[PDB]
Design a protein around this nucleic acid. Structure first.
Ligand SMILES: [Mg+2]
Ligand SMILES: [Mg+2]
Ligand SMILES: [Mg+2]
Ligand SMILES: [Mg+2]
Ligand SMILES: [Mg+2]
Ligand SMILES: [Mg+2]
Ligand SMILES: [Mg+2]
Ligand SMILES: [Mg+2]
Ligand SMILES: [Mg+2]
Ligand SMILES: [Mg+2]
Ligand SMILES: [Mg+2]
Ligand SMILES: [Mg+2]
Lengths: 116, 59, 100, 131, 60
RNA sequence: UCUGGGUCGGGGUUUCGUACGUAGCAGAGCAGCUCCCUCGCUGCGAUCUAUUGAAAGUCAGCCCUCGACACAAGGGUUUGU
RNA sequence: CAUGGUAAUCCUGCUCAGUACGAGAGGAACCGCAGGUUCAGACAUUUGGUGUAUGUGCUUGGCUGAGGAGCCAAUGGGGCGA
RNA sequence: CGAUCGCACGCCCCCCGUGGCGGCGACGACCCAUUCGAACGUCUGCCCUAUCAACUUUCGAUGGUAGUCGCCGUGCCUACCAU
RNA sequence: AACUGCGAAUGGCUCAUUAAAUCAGUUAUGGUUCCUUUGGUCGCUCGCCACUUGGAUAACUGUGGUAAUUCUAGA
């Protein structure tokens, strides 16, 4: 019930089995048996050996999304504040638009009067 | 509710700055009092007179 | 089955004990090696001494008992583990063909 | 604390192993092992973590014809690490130390066995990786 | 071990120190950006699913 | 004996490493047939791919069979307070 | 069970303890703990060795008309191997 | 094949009445030219030494052909040739 | 403060390398590139946002890790 290791052949090596190979360049390899360690030490490619799991995988042998926006209060305008601002649909927005229209009209008339 | 974690909602330090983002937040369609629908942040320090600061809108 | 294993497996290795048979009755699992061949009768005796060292009187709690095949280089613990790893074979394919 | 368990030795007297430090020596020829009481006809032998006396055969002249204490850090003989792993390295290698177990060099090339590392803290410091 | 617990819907992140390894064993052997149930953190965390966003090693 | 032990067979385990045959518009190329064909169609060709973790062995001192087959109340020499 | 044989040995580390002692420098021991050396008696789960299971691939020369399947070369050679 | 920024601000008003127009710039650009250059080449020129007289050419040495690469010309590199 | 832009390839130092090499004078690039400055070009193309489109991150608030660095994570 230790850490579970994998081999040259990709097989599972249970505790008390096989040998661990520590190369001089720092790489550490573990093998299930001397058949696997001889193939590795002879520089044999595991993808060309039919019982290796790398071969059976190379040859294919045998085999969320969301977008949630959470509303939050901000400094100066609470959640109720922004709700009251965004719920100005029933003719309040039109009233603001028409008062802006008349403000622009009176500003333009004042500008014409001042220029002339 | 977890004590002090899932409750007592804290506010964002500052609201939208791009006029498109203000309109998106407040459901503005087009050309309705946009410069006065911006959120004004109130500064109310004890040692100074209180006032409210408005951000410079962009685009 | 240890409490760290929780596998429905017996002490018998995959393929049975080599040169003995299948263990079905009670058994005693002793640390280390024991004189005699396989299926040799052994006499177990209470200690004549008083066990006072720390090697004795120590609670042995097993985390895992190996049950790989001893008839070679076994690499699987149970029949079901072997079947799950290795998938269907030709024998099982023709057996399922016959079963239909 | 903790005492080093017995391991397979595999390096008798007369073995020439690599010298993994930057001291300037290329190899160490083992002439004896520390702590070996001995037996008739039996060659003293050392594993990883063992302190040997060695002479360097290839290396600098100021090192060459002299006896140096050394510590074995990698062995090619497989040894069992009390947890069922049988570990061996690609080559036999050691480093040159003084009588206090302090390295003459300042760096180690390649891995250092755990048995040697925890037994010699000074070598563990200069070790690159621990295997 | 410490846990930097953050609830983005309300902010208010806070640190919870957890010592019992039985609480952390449900977190162990997982990866980042994975959602796990925090029910092993006592009854107070029942009904909570939390995503492992990150962390810092023993050396920082 | 509420049977027994054998001999084959089966299953398991395990060892090696993917059988013969067949098929392929896989294949360095080369050689024959062109009312043809409009890129052909016939071969030779190590090797490759699929069938195929296949084929083969496995107690003789491996494990389990309750399948098949016959055989087993037979023989000889002795032994008494 | 008469009788005969007879077996275990030594060292290191931690702690004791920077302690006793000592002006200082230096510097122990008993208990306990963890391991080694030499020896002994076993054993084969594991690692290694062997390997003519002459088990299974590969391969040289020859031979059976070829294929297939094999064999001979005093164990043909070689890989892996219960 | 400008979704940029500043400065004082002004003209047209029929259609009207809120829009359309304007100057000075700053920043930005595909390309061309210039400036600064850079890079590689042309010709000629260097100390002692023959107790250094033959070098280079397998592994580019000299040249050709077609390419690769490079900002570009070129054995810079590759393949095939010539020696 | 931070993002963006530019500069950091200049200057300064030393003379180890280097003998048709560097370098000096001469000439060429019709065999190449060139920030910046300056001058040209920016309605030259027929082809339900344009009164202006989308998203993220800084800075910033807050929770930290590490003995340590001009180290940085999550929100
Ligand atoms: Mg702007
Ligand atoms: Mg076995
Ligand atoms: Mg002798
Ligand atoms: Mg059988
Ligand atoms: Mg006696
Ligand atoms: Mg004795
Ligand atoms: Mg032959
Ligand atoms: Mg044949
Ligand atoms: Mg013959
Ligand atoms: Mg002969
Ligand atoms: Mg072998
Ligand atoms: Mg010089």
């Amino acid at each position: 019930m230790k850490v579970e290791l994998c081999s040259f052949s990709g097989y599972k090596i249970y505790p008390g089995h096989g040998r661990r190979y520590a190369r001089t360049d720092g790489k550490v390899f573990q093998f299930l048996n001397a058949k696997c360690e001889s193939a590795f030490l002879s520089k044999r490619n595991p993808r060309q050996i039919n019982w290796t799991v790398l071969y059976r995988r190379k040859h294919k042998k045998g085999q969320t999304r969301r977008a949630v926006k959470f509303q939050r209060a901000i400094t100066g305008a609470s959640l109720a504040d922004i709700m009251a601002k965004r719920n100005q649909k029933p003719e309040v927005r039109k009233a603001q638009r028409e008062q802006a229209i008349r403000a622009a009209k009176e500003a333009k008339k004042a500008k014409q009067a001042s220029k002339k | 509710d977890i004590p002090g974690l899932t409750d007592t909602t804290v506010p964002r330090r500052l609201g939208p700055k791009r006029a498109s983002r203000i309109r998106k937040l407040f459901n503005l369609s087009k050309e309705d009092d946009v410069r006065q629908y911006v959120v004004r942040k109130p500064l109310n320090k004890e040692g100074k007179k209180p006032r409210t600061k408005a951000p410079k809108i962009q685009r | 089955s240890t409490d760290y294993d929780l596998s429905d497996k017996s002490i018998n290795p995959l393929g049975g004990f080599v040169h003995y048979g299948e263990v079905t009755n009670d058994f005693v699992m002793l640390k280390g090696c024991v004189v005699g061949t396989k299926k040799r009768v052994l006499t177990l005796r209470k200690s004549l001494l008083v066990q006072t060292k720390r090697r004795a009187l120590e609670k042995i709690d097993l985390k895992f008992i190996d049950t790989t095949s001893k008839f070679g280089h076994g690499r699987f613990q149970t029949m079901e583990e072997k079947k799950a790893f290795m998938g269907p074979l030709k024998k099982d394919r023709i057996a399922k063909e016959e079963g239909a | 604390s903790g005492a080093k368990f017995r391991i397979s030795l595999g390096l008798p007297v007369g073995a020439v192993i690599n010298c993994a430090d930057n001291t300037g020596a290329k190899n160490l020829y083992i002439i004896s092992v520390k702590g070996i009481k001995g037996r008739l006809n039996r060659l003293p032998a050392a594993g990883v973590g063992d302190m040997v006396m060695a002479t360097v055969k290839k290396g600098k002249p100021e090192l060459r014809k002299k006896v140096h204490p050394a510590v074995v850090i990698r062995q090619r003989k497989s040894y069992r690490r009390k947890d069922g792993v049988f570990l061996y390295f690609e080559d036999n290698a050691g480093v040159i130390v003084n009588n206090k177990g302090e390295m003459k060099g300042s760096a180690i090339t390649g891995p250092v066995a755990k048995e040697c590392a925890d037994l010699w803290p000074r070598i563990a410091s200069n070790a690159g990786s621990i295997a | 071990m410490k846990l930097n617990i953050s609830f983005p819907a309300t902010g208010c992140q806070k640190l919870i120190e957890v010592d019992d390894e039985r609480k952390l064993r449900t977190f162990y052997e997982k990866r980042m950006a994975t959602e796990v149930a925090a029910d092993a953190l006592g009854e107070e965390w029942k009904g909570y699913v939390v995503r492992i966003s990150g962390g810092n090693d023993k050396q920082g």
